[PDB]
Design an enzyme around this catalytic site. Structure first.
Site, mmCIF file in Angstrom:
data_model
loop_
_atom_site.group_PDB
_atom_site.id
_atom_site.type_symbol
_atom_site.label_atom_id
_atom_site.label_comp_id
_atom_site.label_asym_id
_atom_site.label_seq_id
_atom_site.Cartn_x
_atom_site.Cartn_y
_atom_site.Cartn_z
ATOM 1 N N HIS A 38 84.622 36.808 55.457
ATOM 2 C CA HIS A 38 85.766 37.706 55.362
ATOM 3 C C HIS A 38 85.404 39.062 54.775
ATOM 4 O O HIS A 38 86.271 39.939 54.708
ATOM 5 C CB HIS A 38 86.879 37.087 54.504
ATOM 6 C CG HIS A 38 87.472 35.837 55.072
ATOM 7 N ND1 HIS A 38 87.964 35.761 56.357
ATOM 8 C CD2 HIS A 38 87.666 34.615 54.522
ATOM 9 C CE1 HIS A 38 88.422 34.542 56.579
ATOM 10 N NE2 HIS A 38 88.254 33.827 55.480
ATOM 11 N N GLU A 47 81.843 29.683 51.644
ATOM 12 C CA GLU A 47 82.498 29.951 52.922
ATOM 13 C C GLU A 47 83.498 31.101 52.810
ATOM 14 O O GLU A 47 84.557 31.096 53.439
ATOM 15 C CB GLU A 47 83.157 28.680 53.460
ATOM 16 C CG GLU A 47 82.197 27.492 53.491
ATOM 17 C CD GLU A 47 82.896 26.170 53.768
ATOM 18 O OE1 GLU A 47 84.016 26.201 54.305
ATOM 19 O OE2 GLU A 47 82.327 25.103 53.447
ATOM 20 N N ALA A 50 86.062 41.021 46.112
ATOM 21 C CA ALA A 50 84.645 40.764 45.879
ATOM 22 C C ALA A 50 83.798 42.001 46.156
ATOM 23 O O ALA A 50 82.809 42.243 45.455
ATOM 24 C CB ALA A 50 84.171 39.596 46.740
HETATM 25 N N1 LIG Z 1 87.139 40.433 50.171
HETATM 26 C C1 LIG Z 1 87.387 39.365 49.424
HETATM 27 N N2 LIG Z 1 87.210 39.409 48.061
HETATM 28 C C2 LIG Z 1 87.468 38.298 47.287
HETATM 29 N N3 LIG Z 1 87.909 37.138 47.886
HETATM 30 C C3 LIG Z 1 88.086 37.089 49.228
HETATM 31 C C4 LIG Z 1 87.830 38.199 50.017
HETATM 32 N N4 LIG Z 1 88.087 37.877 51.301
HETATM 33 C C5 LIG Z 1 88.500 36.590 51.343
HETATM 34 N N5 LIG Z 1 88.501 36.093 50.069
HETATM 35 C C6 LIG Z 1 88.887 34.735 49.664
HETATM 36 O O1 LIG Z 1 87.883 33.799 50.002
HETATM 37 C C7 LIG Z 1 88.474 32.547 50.298
HETATM 38 C C8 LIG Z 1 87.740 31.876 51.452
HETATM 39 S S1 LIG Z 1 88.414 30.250 51.879
HETATM 40 C C9 LIG Z 1 87.348 29.470 50.638
HETATM 41 C C10 LIG Z 1 88.127 28.993 49.419
HETATM 42 C C11 LIG Z 1 87.322 28.243 48.358
HETATM 43 N N6 LIG Z 1 86.070 28.922 48.048
HETATM 44 C C12 LIG Z 1 87.080 26.795 48.773
HETATM 45 O O2 LIG Z 1 85.932 26.379 48.938
HETATM 46 O O3 LIG Z 1 88.021 26.013 48.941
HETATM 47 C C13 LIG Z 1 89.937 32.811 50.622
HETATM 48 O O4 LIG Z 1 90.743 32.070 49.739
HETATM 49 C C14 LIG Z 1 90.142 34.300 50.403
HETATM 50 O O5 LIG Z 1 91.299 34.577 49.645
#
Ligand SMILES: Nc1ncnc2c1ncn2[C@@H]1O[C@H](CSCC[C@H](N)C(=O)O)[C@@H](O)[C@H]1O
Ligand SMILES: Nc1ncnc2c1ncn2[C@@H]1O[C@H](CSCC[C@H](N)C(=O)O)[C@@H](O)[C@H]1O
Ligand SMILES: Nc1ncnc2c1ncn2[C@@H]1O[C@H](CSCC[C@H](N)C(=O)O)[C@@H](O)[C@H]1O
Ligand SMILES: Nc1ncnc2c1ncn2[C@@H]1O[C@H](CSCC[C@H](N)C(=O)O)[C@@H](O)[C@H]1O
Ligand SMILES: Nc1ncnc2c1ncn2[C@@H]1O[C@H](CSCC[C@H](N)C(=O)O)[C@@H](O)[C@H]1O
Ligand SMILES: Nc1ncnc2c1ncn2[C@@H]1O[C@H](CSCC[C@H](N)C(=O)O)[C@@H](O)[C@H]1O
Ligand SMILES: Nc1ncnc2c1ncn2[C@@H]1O[C@H](CSCC[C@H](N)C(=O)O)[C@@H](O)[C@H]1O
Lengths: 280, 281, 280, 280, 280, 279
Positions: D147, D143, D126
């Site tokens: 990260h 959510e 992202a």
């Molecule tokens: N730097 C980054 N770029 C893109 N995606 C990322 C990221 N860091 C974490 N993520 C992704 O963001 C997700 C957060 S958990 C949320 C999952 C989903 N949106 C739901 O609601 O069920 C994880 O699956 C992870 O793979």
């Protein structure tokens, strides 16, 4: 176990269309009561029709929207139940008028039984000459009562006693085709009522009484269904009603209800209309 | 102008105002038989207005069962198919309807072809107590006013068999609250070609004995009492038309039995919509 | 700023399935409170659970629908909050009975605290031998209390004190399996309650008491969530509850809740039912 | 079976364990709205999954994407949110995540529902999106921003968004300031950064060029979801150690209690709508 | 019948697009009033805008949701109408403060004419140094008044007089751009107001005062429309307003309103926010 | 920047300007319902267009056209009301207007959205419709009857409807008789006829063969639209004079105020549902 699958299939092969001729394009019940409606105290036709009446009253209360502390005028108030519900639900005062002495005493018994003689006042009075001063009521309704009166006089009286900016709710019939003389005479001999005006004729009287028209909504099917409930009740209970109201009155209904039903179905419409007395 | 005076009107209600109370209820005005958001019908004929209340009824069942797009629904005792047609269009599902009447199944096939839905609507003469379909073939089902013609234990067990685990069966069934006299039990066969309704516990022992869980129940007795009132009035007011259509023996039987059947209905029976679940896993 | 994209990705490759085993088919929060609900005062589990209890009470009030001026009987009333909210929202008088002296006292102090002792009466009286006369109350409800009593005697006693045409709201569990003996014993050793009957057996008791059944709605998942809330509070606060209730009681829950929860999930259902005493 | 005396003495001693755990009443909470379907089973994970879906339905309702638009799911996870959004609104969805396991699980969801052309799942960062400028009509980060580096991710999302489109964000924020153990518990439990402050977060949203249109607190939902997660990890310690190893599970069992109190007392969680301004 | 089809067609061929430049992508009315809104007492622009003001107030009451028996503090209360509506609708007590002696006199006048002097208290006081004790009010709102004040002071004082757990509803503007000096001057010379802060700067102030942010909703189109309503009435009644307020004040408006509208459209946003004083 | 005393003196002297313009309070009006989306722009024509679109949604909900039906748009303008009805209800729509520029712009709109098989726009007179009897399921005349002979238009709409079809009408009516200058303004400003009286309009409706099923006042919506319009012309006179010539703009500037007062005091505006009876 008293029937087999083959017998049931043959029954529907032979007679199944009797359900389409009476109930419609399916072979199951009509949803005559909305899901949120309570289960009646009993399944008698009068009890179920009574619940449809109260839901009708609730809808009129909702449409007119009387505000707490206001005073409403029930024009042709019957035995008072419409006034009782509006007063209970909205915290308003209600004054009702009727030309039937027994009706008004029953309405006063109703207000006394519920301990609301202070907020409910029922008087024998003529809507074509109301005994109330100008601008006495915040709002008013004439629920299926204008057909017994001269509409121009009653509408003028309602305009007079309303405060400017108040509303008058009317539940009135109207003709769409010109009636024959037998049909016009049924209006008097069946209900002691006048023939309804044309739609344009009615709104000329409304305008000539000083009212603005804020809304109209057709409720013709409700009248048709109500008239069917009335017809079924008189047919199935002719003996009971003859012993009460006389053979001459009942036999007049049995002979006339059929014709008046078809006239209602083909030539008339029934609607709810909100009329505003303009401000300024 | 003005056929009556205030005094004549006042006298009229003094003498006759109670025949409104005796028939229409505690007020002297119309009933709200149609909800305000409902369309104005094409006609005010009793059959036209009842037909509209049938469709809103059907819309409520679709709303209650809630079939999802792409599912396959089994209409147990499907009649002439309008219920299946409406469910197919509104929810984008396939429907398979079964009925024991060759005439009704034929009309349901004409309906599907006239609406261009022969791919998503299948109608077949077949017995609900011995369904030809495989195990776990349908996502959901309903038996809309049809178990009364059946052995309910067989039909429910068969409905259970053809439902996928986790799917629901919508049931619209009658039940007795009293005991029923022997003449009353006979009128079910002779007027309706139906079996007597069971007792409530007896009915739900059959539901449990077939492996169903009970998720909901809602009384619709007033709708059935009104519908039977609409049926009786059509028969009473059109005896001549119906005898020329179905024969005097059939119509006279109705004119003779509808009264007692209505009283038994009112005082001894209850009519409800129940949602039964075939457990998952 | 603290972790890198590769670190986060390797974390969900290794452990992402712990969210699916615990929270569901997604990796986000559940909508456990409706969007129109107020933000609670605390995020404590008992606080959030209490708001869900009030919304539960609101739904029962809306389902039973008591009208203003009526008198309601609360069968197994607990500490009275249900009776209080029903009286505040609908303008009714409530009489609650319970076999626990400590609860009935807390219920009377709750009525005095809110200045509603004139309309809230709480007494220690058995449901299976109610002291009130026949046809005393317009409606009643038993909110998760029949499981402690003989369900034939309480219902017949509720039918007796009810006015004809009145509604009784029942929140009862029912078995779908047969229950082993260790499962039946857990009901008495953990909850001091009887085993639930079968659905068909329950409605024979309902009919045998004279009630019609107007509605049933499944609420099993609510009881399942509530029992999970209960257990999670017991597991995480063992030291306090042992100091509050004794180690024998707490250790009994810690040893049986897990098995009781599986029995609940797999062998029972919980529903809301509206029973009616027929009118005359 | 039990007697009334045994029940009353039970509540006299242990009745208050219900008030310490469930709230100010002694009955169930309404954790599922009355219109929600009965779940396929009462396992905690199955119920929590339904709450996840109703959560997803609410976000779709809030963002309100239009049929024929293309949504970017920033941090798509295993893809179910994308699937539900695609089927309900007739949109194309593209999801990115830094996890190969999750994108493989999301791709099988795309193919499995006969979409594939409308559902696209790729392994991408992202903070460095591979897509061009003004590519998507809308986007959301459910959510997932915890990260990431939030300014980089938010500026990137602003670049790929068409002018006038919205970005739904589900983010957490600190109301206290967090001790260093609390900040470290964030990385060791769920590989994420510490949440920013409220004003700090909106300074970051401002600098990326968004306009803030809405904010709604969902902190109680996160609180309940974390209690569900804790009860599952605790009550299932053996299965989880066997699948994820002892070090990971032991880290959860020792940190979830401190993470839950820090969540309750020092953090808030909300849904916000962020608009990239249309052309002046 | 005084026009022909060719003349109507030519008119739209030549002048039809003036409707698209002023009204929008269609050639018909705007739905400025919801269909369930009552027909206003008259169609004067001030009357219709007054009905819109009252529905705005009904929304703030629904959002803040004051409970019967609470005491609400109106920070910058104007001439009282908002307070009066809240007291009548929710059975609460309201205390209003403003820095204008005339507005307080009009608000006390309004309370006396409605018989609500026991529940409505209006006083001349400064929001930045409120005369009230600590934790005196259950809830409060500052409806379009913080722009006249030092927001940190007013918010800190609002937090002081609020009971813990209570809410404060704020209606405030925020700049999305940076204002030129002539734009900042118009804030003083037209409305005697300060320049709005940024979004993060505002919530830094909110958090500094100790408030949690529970919600935020954009209402910029409402403010923008209200200002158009305000400008049209000023333009079209220049002679009246000059006779009552003097030519200098009206000429200032007539020369600044246009620029003010453009700065409002392009550089500011207006929102409703719920701020919570954390409970203990 | 300002002090508490400076603000208090300001409202002491001028606070009543807010009450004279905005109403009995000193705050914003809720002109857009809370569930409405934030607009793209805060320009007046932008916000007004959203209000026009929500207006169309309401007319779609009121007439309630069912999928597969064919709707006639009597006086269709440039066709956006038709476009939205087709996309939302999956219907065919035929639209007529006496303006060639409007019909051209509507076909462009239909062509741009790929709905030329479901959106037909023709130059035609509603008082002489070229279509056959019983060709449409429903119809609406959205603020177009004021240009026509209402007896000829309504009788011609009744002819092209199938039995049981509904016609939605949005029409004005006088509650008092207009003076001769007020009647003249309708032709000079809008090229429209004077509205009839309410009872007179419904004799025309019944004379064309329609039953009246509903009526709903919408006068405040028209007055607000007329205020939004007038403020647009007042504030952009130089622009519109370059666009339409000084003669057109000077007329609007000299007549809108009087027209607004006649609208406020002597007319009402309503939505009405008329049904051609079934057989
Ligand atoms: N730097 C980054 N770029 C893109 N995606 C990322 C990221 N860091 C974490 N993520 C992704 O963001 C997700 C957060 S958990 C949320 C999952 C989903 N949106 C739901 O609601 O069920 C994880 O699956 C992870 O793979
Ligand atoms: N001229 C008149 N003045 C006052 N009341 C009249 C009247 N003519 C008829 N009524 C009354 O109008 C009523 C019509 S029956 C309708 C009763 C009541 N509105 C209800 O909804 O139930 C009768 O009670 C009759 O007494
Ligand atoms: N054409 C017609 N229209 C309406 N009613 C008719 C009719 N022809 C006959 N009827 C009457 O309708 C009546 C139905 S009453 C029959 C049922 C029974 N009396 C009961 O109590 O339920 C018949 O007695 C019959 O005389
Ligand atoms: N044993 C059986 N197996 C299958 N269908 C049966 C049956 N016994 C009766 N039926 C059918 O059940 C239907 C009852 S009438 C109900 C029709 C349909 N459900 C509707 O809503 O209109 C009839 O069509 C009848 O033919
Ligand atoms: N035999 C009996 N008769 C009357 N009440 C009883 C009873 N046995 C148990 N109870 C009461 O039933 C209650 C069940 S807990 C339910 C409490 C309350 N109805 C609520 O909804 O919160 C206990 O408080 C207990 O005191
Ligand atoms: N420092 C201050 N302390 C208290 N009130 C103030 C203030 N500065 C301005 N005000 C008041 O805030 C109000 C803003 S106009 C808003 C009026 C009112 N809230 C309504 O909704 O109609 C004015 O009445 C002004 O007198
Ligand atoms: N005699 C007539 N026959 C057909 N259309 C006419 C007409 N007289 C005027 N019109 C049309 O009626 C329209 C009125 S403006 C209304 C436009 C459209 N109903 C909308 O809501 O956007 C103009 O498009 C004009 O061309």
């Amino acid at each position: 176990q008293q029937v087999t699958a083959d017998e049931v299939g043959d029954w529907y092969d032979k007679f199944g269309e009797v359900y389409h001729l009476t109930l419609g394009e399916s072979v199951h019940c009509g949803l005559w009561f909305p899901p949120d409606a309570p289960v009646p105290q009993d399944m008698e036709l009068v009890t179920m029709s009574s619940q449809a009446q109260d839901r009708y009253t609730d809808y009129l209360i909702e449409t007119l929207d009387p505000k707490a502390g206001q005073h409403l005028l029930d024009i042709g108030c019957g035995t008072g139940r419409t006034a009782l519900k509006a007063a209970r639900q909205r915290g308003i005062a209600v004054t009702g008028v009727a030309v039937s002495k027994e009706q008004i005493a029953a309405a006063n018994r109703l207000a006394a039984g519920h301990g609301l003689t202070e907020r409910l006042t029922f008087e024998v009075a003529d809507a074509m000459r109301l005994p109330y001063e100008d601008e006495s009521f915040d709002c008013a309704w004439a629920i299926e009562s204008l057909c017994h009166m001269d509409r121009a006089k009653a509408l003028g009286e309602a305009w007079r006693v309303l405060k400017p900016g108040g509303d008058l709710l009317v539940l009135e019939s109207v003709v769409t085709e010109e009636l024959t003389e037998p049909e016009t005479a049924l209006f008097e001999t069946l209900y002691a009522a006048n023939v309804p005006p044309r739609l344009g004729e009615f709104f000329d009287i409304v305008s000539g009484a000083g009212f603005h028209t804020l809304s109209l909504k057709d409720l013709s099917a409700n009248l048709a269904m109500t008239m069917n409930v009335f017809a079924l009740g008189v047919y199935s209970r002719r003996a009971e009603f003859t012993e009460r109201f006389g053979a001459e009155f009942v036999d007049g209904l049995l002979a006339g209800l059929g014709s008046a039903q078809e006239t209602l179905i083909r030539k008339t419409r029934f609607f709810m209309a909100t009329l505003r007395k303009p401000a300024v």
